[PDB]
From Swiss-Prot, chains A, B:
It comes from Streptomyces rugosporus. Reaction occurs via a unique trapping mechanism whereby the lid-like action of the N-terminal tail imposes conformational constraints on the beta-barrel catalytic core, which enhances the proximity and polarization effects of reactive groups (1,3-diene and alkene) to drive cyclization in a regio- and stereo-specific manner. It comes from the Bacteria. It catalyses: 4-[(1R,2R,4aS,5S,8aR)-2-[(2R,3R,5E,7E)-3-ethyl-2-hydroxy-5,7-dimethylnona-5,7-dien-1-yl]-5-hydroxy-1-methyl-1,2,4a,5,6,7,8,8a-octahydronaphthalene-1-carbonyl]-2-methylidene-5-oxo-2,5-dihydro-1H-pyrrol-3-olate = (1S,3R,6R,8R,9R,11R,14S,15S,19R,20R)-8-ethyl-9,15-dihydroxy-3,4,6,20-tetramethyl-21,23-dioxo-24-azapentacyclo[20.2.1.0(1,6).0(11,20).0(14,19)]pentacosa-4,12,22(25)-trien-25-olate. The gene is pyrI4. Its EC number is 5.-.-.-. This is Spiro-conjugate synthase. Keywords: Antibiotic biosynthesis, Disulfide bond, Isomerase. Disruption phenotype: Cells lacking this gene lose the ability to produce pyrroindomycins. Involved in the biosynthesis of the spirotetramate antibiotics pyrroindomycins. Catalyzes the intramolecular cyclization forming the spiro-conjugate moiety in pyrroindomycins, via an exo-selective [4+2] cycloaddition reaction. The N-terminal 10-AA residues are absolutely required for enzymatic activity. GO terms for molecular function: isomerase activity. Changing residue 53 to R: Loss of catalytic activity.
């Protein structure tokens, strides 16, 4: 029950470019990294959770305000969104929609993540759409993973790559 | 090394509805299933594979024709797309882009998938956009998981759910 499988920002850059419509983007990974916005070495933790429980867990909705810290420890901004438990057994799956608000703009994240896989130290991916500032008119992916698995409340390792 | 965690079509219908802008869809899971286009109990397997190998694996492209079968083995159509190996270790990650062609119309799948996690028998999720016929104007998710691992050629359980 321990199986890390991270992505690096270069890999994320190629994913971002391929999906943006730069079909030969794997030819030069460096060139793809260079043309992307990159947020590496982020952690997020919750500052507010509003939980709306349901018997047995399926349909439990969490409104959350998560805080982004950079590698030093500076607050870059918040991720405000909704989690919905789609399923509990044998894996917990949540739907996630979040708007991330930084000083230089905003981007949305949408996805469907296997929370049990994350407890196995695995990485999940959400789809990022730019919404305001330098992120506007760009798109890519966001990685999540449990930062320290013997922490409570849990902290998340986060990368964001758009182009 | 065997940790399954699948998504039922009802859980996928909720996700599709939330992703689509019907924000109360967890209220009545059955009612989200009802406004959704559902393709389930079908499998795919590789018919054509054209790999262009990159030393070290990162950048290996795969051009693929997959064939869809229903639960009684009948061919329903093809999924034609492209994969790129983003990373190999510790987990092999791949970007994917496919156009599925069925009798009742077409849909495009895009996503980044952990191929190692798939060998642990875990489900991966692609985003899906309707392109024609009953799928047109609709979005949602695709799940994949190996059905039987040391079957050859290897087969993947598929669910697609849009609205
Ligand atoms: C019933 O409640 C629970 O058992 C439970 C389970 C898991 C979690 C963790 O997930 C969250 O709440 N939300 C944030 C953190 C992780 C995923 C992404 C998400 C986030 O910041 N994004 C999308 C940027 C919270 C609660
Ligand atoms: C070095 O790596 C390889 O050579 C290699 C590894 C894995 C695979 C299997 O993946 C595929 O070909 N494609 C299909 C199967 C899996 C994901 C879904 C995908 C599919 O049908 N979709 C998205 C409709 C093929 C080649």
């Amino acid at each position: 029950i321990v199986d890390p499988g991270p992505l690096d920002v270069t890999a994320l850059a190629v994913a971002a470019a391929l999906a943006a419509g730069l079909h030969s983007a794997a030819d030069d990974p460096a060139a793809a990294l260079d043309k992307c916005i990159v947020l590496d070495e982020l952690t997020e933790f919750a500052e507010k959770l509003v939980v709306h429980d349901r018997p047995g867990g399926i349909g439990t909705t969490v409104e959350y305000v998560e805080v982004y810290e950079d590698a030093s420890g500076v607050r870059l901004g918040t991720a405000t969104g909704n989690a919905v438990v789609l399923k509990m057994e044998p894996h917990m799956w949540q739907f996630h929609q979040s708007v991330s608000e930084l000083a230089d703009g905003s981007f949305e994240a949408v996805g469907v993540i296997d929370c049990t896989a994350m407890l196995r130290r695995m990485t999940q991916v959400l789809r990022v759409t730019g919404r305001s500032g330098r992120y506007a008119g760009k798109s890519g992916f966001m990685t999540l993973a449990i930062s320290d698995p013997n922490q409570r409340p849990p902290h998340y390792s986060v990368q964001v790559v758009l182009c």
